[PDB]
Write a protein that binds this ligand. Structure first.
Ligand SMILES: [Mg+2]
Ligand SMILES: [Mg+2]
Ligand SMILES: [Mg+2]
Ligand SMILES: [Mg+2]
Ligand SMILES: [Mg+2]
Ligand SMILES: [Mg+2]
Ligand SMILES: [Mg+2]
Ligand SMILES: [Mg+2]
Ligand SMILES: [Mg+2]
Ligand SMILES: [Mg+2]
Ligand SMILES: [Zn+2]
Lengths: 230, 48
RNA sequence: UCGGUACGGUUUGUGUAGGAUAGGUGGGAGACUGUGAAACCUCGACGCCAGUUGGGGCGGAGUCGUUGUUGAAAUACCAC
RNA sequence: GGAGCUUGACUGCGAGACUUACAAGUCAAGCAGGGACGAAAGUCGGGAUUAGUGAUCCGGCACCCCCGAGUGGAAGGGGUG
RNA sequence: CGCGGGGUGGAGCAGCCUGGUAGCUCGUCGGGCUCAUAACCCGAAGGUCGUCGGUUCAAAUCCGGCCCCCGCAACCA
């Protein structure tokens, strides 16, 4: 079924591995084919994530943005909030800002709080429960640099984390970008995964990689190319 | 019950010394300051 | 005739709480009907409460998660 | 006999002796490096002392980076523990 | 030294690959019936699932370190 999906499936080949340029060249021809969404990257690694020291986790600075609003409320006191309104955070307050969100307009994305204020801000998670806007050290939002970590959210620091079955599922941004501008994202993101190779990674490290949307099919990519994205 | 254990430096990892402990009275690895001839000074030494 | 291996399609998954949305991860409100929607029939598939159903037979345009759980939360839908 | 802190149960050496068919065995002042204890003098190269052990060959592991069968490497070898 | 499994109630053994309950057998206790708990019958005690840590909301199960047995193939100058 799905007559709009077979039309893209009668286009991309299975028995060929494409270049990173051709991968975004059909991602634009899938986001023209389908209704537009995020370009997904599924990396299949040669690690075993059941041993502890082969676990892969990290982030990436995409130089063309991940296509995200990044509305930030900053729960801090003193200059720590004042360094965030100068950073470019639109909703900046104090213990007052505890009150302005739990009653209404809980419309932001991250809450980077100081470790001294984690008690009173932690009750806002009772309305920020299913959306994960609570201050979290696991997302880089509880630290001593509560100011310029908002700028990490603005530019598109996408955190990755390998699953139980050695797969990195991963994004490069919205599909409204240029084809050569997606390979700038896609090039400077694989190399970030190449940074986090453990020494005990037996075998071939980046075995299989594919490029898909959340609406169209996947694209077979050649893992041989790690430098020549330009 | 009294095995021959070797002591390695905690910096350069050279196996400078060999000795004996009791496997039952001291069931974990020894820690002693010993002279490391590579570093030219006293370093810490665990087992291997 | 019974396998092994490389690869594709199909399908599988039921502590309690609770959508009956019932494997992990990702993001996912538009994929969703001539690719002829829903009702209705029942050649079947399995079994642990309601079949999740690969039945391909009947239709004449939804087979929506923000509510109200499985960490809990989607699991319509797509890559893996 | 009791107590406090410690790792000298050191590395580079060693004038001069004991014992002795030979191979072996044993003792050693003092010098330097880096240390422990002590206010200092000093003392410490396992244990009051003498038993608790096994030549060579052949290999194993760790380090040094000496040789490397035309050359560059590697294999293999060599030294030290 | 490599590999190739195993430890779970007093003894024996599943569950482990694939994550949500600790069970079965024998022994014991108590009760019943009986010449005889020989048998048969019912109830219960007996467990950090070898110990440390680690990963997950949650581990007997999965990872790693440790003790502890059992095999095999060497090494054995
Ligand atoms: Mg002791
Ligand atoms: Mg000694
Ligand atoms: Mg001499
Ligand atoms: Mg001195
Ligand atoms: Mg002093
Ligand atoms: Mg002396
Ligand atoms: Mg000989
Ligand atoms: Mg040569
Ligand atoms: Mg060599
Ligand atoms: Mg020498
Ligand atoms: Zn050293």
């Amino acid at each position: 079924t799905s007559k709009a999906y077979r039309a893209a499936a009668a286009k991309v080949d299975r028995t060929n591995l494409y270049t990173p340029l051709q991968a975004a060249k059909l991602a634009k021809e899938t986001s023209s084919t389908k209704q537009d969404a995020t370009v997904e990257v599924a990396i299949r690694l040669g690690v075993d994530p059941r041993k502890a020291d082969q676990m892969v986790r990290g982030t990436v600075n995409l130089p063309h943005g991940t296509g995200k609003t990044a509305r930030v409320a900053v729960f801090a006191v003193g200059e720590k909030a004042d360094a965030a309104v100068a950073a470019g955070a639109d909703v900046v307050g104090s213990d007052d800002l505890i009150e302005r969100i739990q009653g209404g307009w809980l419309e932001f994305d991250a809450a980077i709080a100081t470790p001294d204020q984690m008690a009173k801000v932690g009750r806002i998670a009772r309305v920020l429960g299913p959306r994960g806007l609570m201050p979290n050290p696991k997302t880089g939002t509880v630290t001593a640099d509560v100011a310029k970590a908002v700028a990490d959210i603005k530019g598109g620091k996408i955190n990755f984390r390998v699953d139980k079955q050695a797969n990195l599922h991963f994004v490069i941004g919205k599909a409204s970008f240029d084809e050569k501008l997606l390979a700038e994202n896609y090039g400077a993101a694989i190399d970030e995964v190449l940074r986090l190779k453990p020494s005990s990674s037996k075998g071939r490290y980046l075995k299989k990689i594919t490029v898909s949307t959340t609406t169209g099919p996947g694209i077979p990519v050649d893992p041989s190319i790690t430098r020549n994205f330009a | 019950v009294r095995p021959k254990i070797t002591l390695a430096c905690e910096v350069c990892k050279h196996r400078n010394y060999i000795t004996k402990k009791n496997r039952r009275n001291d069931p974990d690895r020894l820690e002693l300051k010993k002279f490391c001839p590579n570093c030219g000074k006293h370093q810490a030494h665990r087992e291997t």
